[PDB]
A = this chain, B = another copy of it.
Amino acid sequence: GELLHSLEGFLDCSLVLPPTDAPSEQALLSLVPVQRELLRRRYQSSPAKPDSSFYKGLDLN
């Protein structure tokens, strides 16, 4: 399930370029801001798990 969720997140932050008659350089360079925004949306969460390494009491607080 975690791998499936990660794949869904991967597919959410991808963009498709349809066949456009514009010059190649302009069409390919127009993607920089949109891609930057999508990646900024990709890396914003980065949550995995809290610091649950050990629930120690240690007898001395």
Contact = CB atoms under 8 A, between A and B. Distances in A.
Interface of A: 10, 13-25, 27-29, 31-32, 35-36, 38-39, 42, 50-52, 55-56
B18 A24 contact: no
- Identical copies of this chain, number: 3
Contacts of A10: 18-19
Contact of A31 (B28, B38, B42, B52): B28
A27 B35 contact: yes
A42 B19 contact: yes
Nearest to A32: B24
A28 B35 contact: yes
Nearest to A39: B19
